[PDB]
Each structure stands twice: as structure tokens, then as C-alpha cells.
Amino acid sequence: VNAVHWFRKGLRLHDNPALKECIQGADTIRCVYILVGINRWRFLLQCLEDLDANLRKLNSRLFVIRGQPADVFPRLFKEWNITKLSIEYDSEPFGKERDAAIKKLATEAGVEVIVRISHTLYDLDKIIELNGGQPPLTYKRFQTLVSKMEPITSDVIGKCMTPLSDDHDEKYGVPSLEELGFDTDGLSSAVWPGGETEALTRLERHLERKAWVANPRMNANSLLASPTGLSPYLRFGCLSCRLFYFKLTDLYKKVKKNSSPPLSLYGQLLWREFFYTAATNNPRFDKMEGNPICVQIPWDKNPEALAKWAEGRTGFPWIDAIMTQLRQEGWIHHLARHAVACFLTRGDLWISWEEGMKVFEELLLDADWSINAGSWMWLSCSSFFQQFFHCYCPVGFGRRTDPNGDYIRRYLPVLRGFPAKYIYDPWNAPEGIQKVAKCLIGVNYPKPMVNHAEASRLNIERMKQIYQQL
Numbered sequence: 098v099n100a101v102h103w104f105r106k107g108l109r110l111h112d113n114p115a116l117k118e119c120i121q122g123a124d125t126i127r128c129v130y131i132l133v134g135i136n137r138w139r140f141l142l143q144c145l146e147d148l149d150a151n152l153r154k155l156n157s158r159l160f161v162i163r164g165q166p167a168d169v170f171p172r173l174f175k176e177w178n179i180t181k182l183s184i185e186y187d188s189e190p191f192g193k194e195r196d197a198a199i200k201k202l203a204t205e206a207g208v209e210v211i212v213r214i215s216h217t218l219y220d221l222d223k224i225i226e227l228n229g230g231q232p233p234l235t236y237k238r239f240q241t242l243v244s245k246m247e248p249i250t251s252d253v254i255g256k257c258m259t260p261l262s263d264d265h266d267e268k269y270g271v272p273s274l275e276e277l278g279f280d281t282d283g284l285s286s287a288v289w290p291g292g293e294t295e296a297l298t299r300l301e302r303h304l305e306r307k308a309w310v311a312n313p314r315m316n317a318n319s320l321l322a323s324p325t326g327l328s329p330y331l332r333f334g335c336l337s338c339r340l341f342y343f344k345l346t347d348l349y350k351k352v353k354k355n356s357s358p359p360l361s362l363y364g365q366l367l368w369r370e371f372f373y374t375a376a377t378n379n380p381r382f383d384k385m386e387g388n389p390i391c392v393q394i395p396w397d398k399n400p401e402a403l404a405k406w407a408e409g410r411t412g413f414p415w416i417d418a419i420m421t422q423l424r425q426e427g428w429i430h431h432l433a434r435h436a437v438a439c440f441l442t443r444g445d446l447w448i449s450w451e452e453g454m455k456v457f458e459e460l461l462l463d464a465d466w467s468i469n470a471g472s473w474m475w476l477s478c479s480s481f482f483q484q485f486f487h488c489y490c491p492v493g494f495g496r497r498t499d500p501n502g503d504y505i506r507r508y509l510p511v512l513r514g515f516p517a518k519y520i521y522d523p524w525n526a527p528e529g530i531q532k533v534a535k536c537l538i539g540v541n542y543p544k545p546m547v548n549h550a551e552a553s554r555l556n557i558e559r560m561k562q563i564y565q566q567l
């Protein structure tokens with residue numbers, strides 16, 4: 098009779114099978130959302146504003162509640178006389194633990210829990226069954242398992258109604274950044290605007306781009322936020338990965354013949370799936386110690402080095418530029434992640450991937466518990482059989498990605514006056530050049546915090562020797 102849909106990810110009305118099923122046989126439906134850096138919070142709140150606005154258009158509203166689910170749902174169930182609760186499935190270990198506790202409470206209150214998988218393409222548990230009860234520990238094996246697996250104008254609440262009270266905006270309104278305790282004087286408009294509406298606009302354009310302008314290699318421009326980038330939208334569920342996957346496939350077929358498209362066309366999607374699968378039964382996935390798939394590495398504790406890196410004050414412009422864009426905007430290119438993750442961990446500073454992961458959790462829009470832990474193990478060569486015999490150069494990688502160094506000048510204006518010859522290694526500029534640039538190295542911008550040549554040589558050696566050498 099009275100039903101609730103509970104938003105956590107899946108922050109969208111399109112491709113929402115849990116919501117659709119929840120509404121079957123229901124008199125009433127209420128959609129609820131139960132409440133570290135400012136960009137993440139802004140993105141979430143914009144998602145919630147978008148949902149509320151779109152629900153409004155259907156004579157509904159989003160119900161935002163501040164509290165712990167375990168403390169909220171029982172009295173909600175009683176007040177509203179709820180007998181059905183639906184959720185999109187969450188594979189993440191702390192998510193499963195949360196949802197297990199809420200199921201217990203719901204069973205206690207006579208409340209049916211409806212669970213549908215739609216944050217991912219696949220049933221992750223079935224992949225694990227196909228692999229003998231443990232996740233594939235290499236991306237290639239995962240690709241093989243899934244190949245042996247698979248083959249918006251409506252009113253999503255049309256069959257139901259939502260009771261609404263006059264004080265809804267007050268009681269159940271989406272909070273503002275200020276209400277969450279943020280200072281807002283220091284924000285321009287978001288580079289990555291939140292919400293389903295935006296996601297669906299970007300999807301169309303994304304697909305237009307793949308068809309028209311393309312049918313894809315790195316250039317300097319790729320380092321900047323694309324207006325057709327989808328990765329934050331996927332992580333929040335603003336864009337269904339299944340919709341994305343289906344649209345891609347059909348357009349590929351339209352444009353290219355039959356063509357059994359390359360795995361590379363689904364790389365974004367499959368890599369995220371791979372880490373969710375790796376994480377789902379591993380409550381220590383975000384740890385080194387006690388984590389069964391993590392190689393144990395003698396990382397060092399250097400809180401000042403970690404802070405220099407986190408803050409973009411390493412003295413390597415390439416690294417600092419990247420960490421500055423990350424903090425300013427909330428997204429950086431996957432190749433830029435390689436650079437700054439390699440620098441912090443196996444390459445230059447020898448600091449645990451756990452520590453890098455924490456910073457990214459605070460700043461990176463498309464990071465969640467599974468993806469972020471997974472990526473950081475991958476980039477530090479702590480898991481997934483990744484190769485540690487090469488170390489990204491914190492000068493050359495940048496110089497090969499943006500030869501002119503505009504990216505540097507863009508995120509590090511203090512360096513704007515250096516010529517391209519020195520913009521990735523300003524410490525090598527003659528002092529007169531530094532002076533013309535109005536930037537003395539050591540004074541206005543720091544010296545490089547490490548000798549890359551030595552650091553990288555020693556660390557590759559030390560990583561090699563953690564393993565038996567033949």
C-alpha cells in the first residue's frame with residue numbers, strides 16, 4: 098500500500114528498476130535521500146536539487162532527511178505506514194552492511210525490501226560465481242568472464258501519487274552548501290554541474306561527438322574538463338551505465354557496420370565494473386594491512402611530503418598543476434592520475450597509496466569507496482599484477498602531454514612567465530629567466546621536493562627487491 102524508494106546512488110529517474118517495481122501495487126510513493134570537500138558536496142546537492150525539481154514536475158518531491166538510516170527508517174515506517182522499501186543494489190562492503198541492517202529492521206516492521214541491480218551492467222555476484230567464488234584479480238580475466246555473460250519522456254511515478262505537506266520545503270528540502278557549513282564566497286560556477294538532467298544532455302552530445310568529430314588519442318586539450326565527460330555522472334548514478342552502454346553499442350553499430358565493437362569502446366564502463374567486483378566481498382579493500390589482494394609494501398610515513406603533494410607544492414609543476422586542477426574542479430584526466438599517483442607512491446615519495454586515496458576521496462568527483470581504493474592499488478602496483486619496472490617522469494610526461502606547458506600556466510599562474518623550455522622544470526632556468534618570469538625558484542615557487550633521478554632509481558630497485566629476484 099505505502100511505499101518508499103531510497104536514493105543513495107541511482108540519483109536519477111531514468112533506468113530505475115527498483116523505483117518502477119516499488120510502485121507496482123502501491124497507493125503512495127515517497128522517494129527519500131538520507132544525508133568531504135566542497136566540490137563533492139556541491140555536486141551531490143545539485144543532484145538532489147535536480148531530482149527534487151524533476152519529481153516536482155510529476156507532482157512529487159524528493160524527501161531529504163539528515164540522519165543515520167538505522168535511526169530514521171523505523172519511525173518513518175511507522176508514521177507513513179510503510180510496507181515496501183526499494184533500493185538500487187549497492188555492491189560496496191559497507192553499503193551491504195548498511196543495507197543488511199536496514200533489511201533486518203524492515204523485516205521486523207513488516208516491510209518488504211525490493212532490491213534491483215542497476216548501478217552496474219552486471220550482477221557482480223554472478224561474475225564471482227563464474228570465477229569460483231573470488232573476484233578476478235586481473236582486468237583481462239574479468240573481461241573474459243563478462244564476455245561469457247550478457248547477450249525517457251515518461252512519468253516514472255505515473256501509477257502512483259505522493260502525499261505532500263505545506264511545510265515540505267522546510268522539513269524535507271535539499272540543504273544548501275551554507276547549511277552544511279561551507280563558506281561559499283570562494284566558488285565560481287561548477288565546472289561539473291550535478292544531476293540527471295545534465296547527465297542526459299551530456300550523453301547526447303557525447304554520442305554526437307563519437308559519431309561526428311570522431312569514430313581517440315591524447316592531446317593537451319584532453320587535460321581540461323570536457324563538456325561531454327560522463328564519469329562523475331556515472332559514479333553518482335545520474336547517468337545509467339546501462340543506458341550509456343546500450344546507446345554506445347547501437348550508435349557504434351549504426352556508424353560502423355556490424356562490428357563486434359572493441360573492448361576499448363567500453364573501457365570506462367568495464368574498468369569501473371572490475372573494481373566494484375574486486376571490492377564487493379572485501380571489507381579491507383581500502384587497506385594494505387589485512388587486505389588479501391594487496392601486496393604488502395614498506396611505505397614511509399612523511400606527513401610533510403604528503404601535504405606538499407596533496408596541496409600541489411611539490412616543486413614539480415606537472416604534479417602541482419594536476420593536484421591544483423583536482424582541488425579546484427574535482428576532475429583530472431586518467432593519465433594525470435597515473436602521474437600524481439605514481440609520484441606519491443612507487444615512483445618518487447614512497448608514501449602509501451592509502452594516503453593518496455584519502456585525498457582523492459576528499460576531492461575527486463568520480464571516486465567512490467571501491468573505485469578509489471582499486472585505482473590507487475592499481476596505480477601504486479599494490480595489486481592487479483601491475484608493472485613497476487617503469488616510473489612516470491614528472492617532467493617528461495607533462496612535456497609530452499602538453500608540449501607548450503599551457504596546462505601549467507593555467508593551474509599555476511605563478512609560473513605563467515616561464516618559457517616552454519623550462520615550464521616543466523623551472524629549477525633549470527637561468528636566474529635571469531626566473532627573474533623575468535617574476536618567479537624565483539625557492540622563493541615564489543618551491544624547489545622540487547625530491548631528486549627525481551635518484552628517488553625513482555632507488556624506489557624501482559626497492560620495489561624490485563620486495564619480490565624474489567631470479
Ligand SMILES: [Cl-]
Nearest residue numbers: 106107216334
Ligand atoms: Cl546508479
